[PDB]
Structure 1
Amino acid sequence: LPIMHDSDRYELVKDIGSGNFGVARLMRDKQSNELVAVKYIERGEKIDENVKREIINHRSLRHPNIVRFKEVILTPTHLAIVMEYASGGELFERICNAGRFSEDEARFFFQQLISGVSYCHAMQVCHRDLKLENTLLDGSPAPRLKICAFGYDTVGTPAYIAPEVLLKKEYDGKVADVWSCGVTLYVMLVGAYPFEDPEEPKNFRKTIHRILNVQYAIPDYVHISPECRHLISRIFVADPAKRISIPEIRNHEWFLKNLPADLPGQSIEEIMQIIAEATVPP
């Protein structure tokens, strides 16, 4: 990992290498005191089109519940991509710490989740560009949800995979995403993944089976409003045609409860200048 740059702007906090921020550098902005992550791609043949793509693509994303691009820098050696860093850890970890959430806390996060997914869809980012199986939390004393988009250790359950995705080579990514969000809601409320047998999580055949046949069962000791239960039943629908849609959720009674109403970087020119300047290696 390439050495420490712009001491005037950023302080090296810590080099990390095992999250979903990838292998990265953790740095503080000596003005905002803001925490930021910094990825790196050697200068040369790597600085290609699909990169430039990702960078521009990403910058477009501006919704707060997203891990936002900040800036691009040029070193002699590398391309450094600097973005927001969620210092609050994984949402899953908070769940495990809690045992499970109250329906109201689950609703609080789920609102942010839908807001960010909706926004991302409205910029045409479906499915596999979105790490909806491992969402994170910012550092704040009141935690904001933070979704990673484009990554240029952590266990990922197959439970996140929608049945049509299991069964088919082509599908609507947005609908699949809805399924995913269902998984996250469930896990928040139950403290365990649906479909997955908690005692043989590595029995993938069994898991997949239950996904295909939509076999889930809210524990007797878990008690949720009938509205909530309904919403869940409306997401866990095998037929993508019949699965509730994002807007439909945006108007669902459970979703609307206590819903907050809220729900100067670089010239793209100079960005392109630095990408260019970066495609050649001294």
Structure 2
Amino acid sequence: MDLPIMHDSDRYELVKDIGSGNFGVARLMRDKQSNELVAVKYIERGEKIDENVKREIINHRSLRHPNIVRFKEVILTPTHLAIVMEYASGGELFERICNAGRFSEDEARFFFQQLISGVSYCHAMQVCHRDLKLENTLLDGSPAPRLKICAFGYGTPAYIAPEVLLKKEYDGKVADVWSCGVTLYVMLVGAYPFEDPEEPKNFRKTIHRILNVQYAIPDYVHISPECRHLISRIFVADPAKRISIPEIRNHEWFLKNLPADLPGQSIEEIMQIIAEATVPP
């Protein structure tokens, strides 16, 4: 729905109003102090400001890892609460794959290492699964792109692990491993696994393949035995048997060329603003 007029024109330069994408209906602006490009999501003051929004905002604000799309600040308008966050201006990872046809094994590993670091961090903060848009990770503006995961944002069924389709109870972290595997596969192969590429809207078939873990790396795609093995260890239907993030962190494919590395807004101010934004002019 339509966005309120520009505000805070003394810290922010308005870059563009965008009405669709991963950041949805949002507002691109520039911080005049940092030179940083940020995105702003808007929620109408009033009832819409509820305990889920409260919990998402708090949780978002808590996350400080360079591969997570980070929370900047919350701002009050007379009609909306403004939530300012980092903007990934590099587009979707998927678009880069398509442009390249497929990635080399080394470029895939470069991104996959960032993916797993970000996911490992989220998991230790108890942010699993539904809190992460792992099916549509993004890239920053950098010439050498950094991976960016929207957590708490405000596709292909391939990303859905078999247990998520069949079982009543499941561990979300383990389902995340499956999803990472799918992202790895697509980077290497240039197409999703399980999904029939000439029939991508055939969800029945896709699901059948997911359940039976039926995938096949094309003959012309050549990957190391290490890489092939890691994939076979992620694409395991029984979640109890699936390789875990820690085990992935210790896998030899993952360790190759691994970079050793892998003053906000006060909680008082944020809670006070969320509170005030419950009253709806």
TM-score by length of 2: 0.98
CA apart distance, 1:151: 1.6
Q: Which moved more, 1:47-56 or 1:110-119?
A: 47-56
Instruction: Encode CA deviations 1:14-64: one digit per residue, 9 max, x unaligned.
Output: 101211212111101112111100001111112222211111111110001
Partner of 2:183: 184
Kept in 2, the 8 Å contact 1:95–1:188? The answer is: yes
Is the partner of 2:59 in helix, strand or coil?
helix
CA apart distance, 1:265: 1.7
Superposition misfits of 4+ residues, deviation over 6 angstroms: none
List gaps (5 residues or longer) in structure 2: none
CA apart distance, 1:251: 0.2
CA apart distance, 1:104: 0.2
Question: 1 CA distance for matches of 2:161 and 2:52?
Answer: 27
Partner of 1:21: 23
CA apart distance, 1:181: 0.3
Q: Which moved more, 1:32-41 or 1:87-96?
A: 32-41
Q: Which moved more, 1:17-26 or 1:135-144?
A: 17-26
Matches within 5 A, 1:44-83: 44-83=46-85
Instruction: Encode CA deviations 1:97-144: one digit per residue, 9 max, x unaligned.
Output: 000000000000000000000000000011111000000000001100
Question: 2 CA distance for matches of 1:82 and 1:6?
Answer: 12
Kept in 2, the 8 Å contact 1:43–1:281? The answer is: yes
Kept in 2, the 8 Å contact 1:22–1:151? The answer is: no
CA apart distance, 1:150: 1.0
Q: Which moved more, 1:43-52 or 1:254-263?
A: 43-52
Q: Which moved more, 1:26-35 or 1:172-181?
A: 26-35
Partner of 2:164: 165
Instruction: Encode CA deviations 1:221-246: one digit per residue, 9 max, x unaligned.
Output: 00000000000000000000000000
Question: 2 CA distance for matches of 1:49 and 1:186?
Answer: 37
Is the partner of 1:89 in helix, strand or coil?
coil
Question: 2 CA distance for matches of 1:36 and 1:254?
Answer: 35
Paired-residue identity, %: 100
CA apart distance, 1:169: 2.5
